[PDB]
């Protein structure tokens, strides 16, 4: 067939991926992968505030996918996602997640992220504090916790549905 398990394992090594999952993603699956992530961060002697940032970005990105799938009525079977967590050579963690979205939703999402990427930490805080009382707390929190600007991409399809992928560098 087409399944090449060694080719994937080597691609994960090339990208320095420590954890990655693809498929239907449930509440309990989110938490259990987060538990593997927290153990890995502890085994790598992550500084306490760095460990919380990486975990927080993982939870919020993956819970945004859950929230979207609920809003669009998707079922357990339909609520699918691709999540990856890597660590750069300099020690910075990279948390990436992707999911299928309606095409109008995907285009409006990349706009909000492009509007988020260029704000400094003080502007991100103000927009965050204002959304406490269009990008919301989740994307704003991920942007605030990143050491690099948030990056997003969108692979459109004449299905009407697009693949949205987001990455944060912690």
């Amino acid at each position: 067939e087409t399944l090449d398990l060694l080719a994937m394992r080597e691609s994960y090594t090339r990208q320095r991926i420590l954890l990655c999952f693809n498929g239907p993603i449930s509440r309990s699956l989110i938490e259990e992968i987060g538990h593997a992530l927290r153990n890995y961060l502890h085994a790598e002697q992550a500084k306490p505030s760095e460990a919380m940032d990486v975990f927080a970005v993982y939870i919020e990105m993956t819970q945004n996918i859950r929230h979207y799938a609920n809003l669009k009525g998707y079922g357990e079977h339909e609520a699918a996602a691709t999540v990856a967590i890597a660590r750069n050579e300099d020690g910075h963690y990279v948390v990436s997640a992707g999911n299928l979205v309606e095409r109008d939703d995907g285009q409006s999402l990349v706009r909000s992220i492009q509007a988020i990427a260029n704000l400094d930490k003080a502007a991100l805080k103000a927009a965050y504090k204002e959304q406490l009382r269009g990008a919301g707390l989740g994307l704003l929190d991920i942007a605030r916790k990143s050491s690099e600007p948030l990056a997003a991409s969108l692979k459109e399809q004449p299905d009407g549905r697009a693949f949205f992928s987001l990455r944060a560098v912690i």
Binding site: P48, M52, F55, E60, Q63
Partner: protein, 127 residues
């Protein structure tokens, strides 16, 4: 136990104790449930009830760690009830304990405290 509130904690939700007679609301642990108002709805109701009449002080003793966005909104709703009662002359108080080696919890507690004008303490501990 009738007027009290005892909620055991889990991996993704904090443990909560509402002591009605002592006027104390305590919470410990992480909080990242998918629908935080399934958890915090009864806590908000408990706070609103305590604050609706009487003059007894209400103090919040928090040992919370990571809160997701939904829990932060629910937490803000609780602190808005404290602030409203405090502007009306009700004595309220909050203490947030945290491990000194993790400044993100102190930074989160500080962001909450900038929207509050009641006594609000952040206490570091050497674990």
């Amino acid at each position: 136990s009738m007027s009290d509130l005892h909620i055991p904690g889990t991996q993704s939700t904090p443990a909560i104790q509402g002591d009605w007679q002592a006027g104390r609301l305590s919470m410990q642990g992480d909080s990242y449930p998918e629908n935080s108002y399934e958890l915090f709805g009864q806590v908000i109701d408990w706070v609103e009830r305590f604050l609706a009449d009487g003059q007894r002080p209400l103090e919040l003793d928090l040992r919370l760690l990571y809160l997701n966005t939904s829990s932060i909104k629910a937490m803000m709703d609780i602190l808005d009830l404290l602030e409203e009662a405090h502007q009306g002359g009700r004595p309220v108080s909050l203490r947030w304990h945290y491990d000194r080696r993790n400044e993100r919890v102190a930074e989160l507690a500080e962001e909450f405290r900038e929207d509050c004008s009641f006594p609000f303490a952040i206490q570091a501990h050497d674990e």
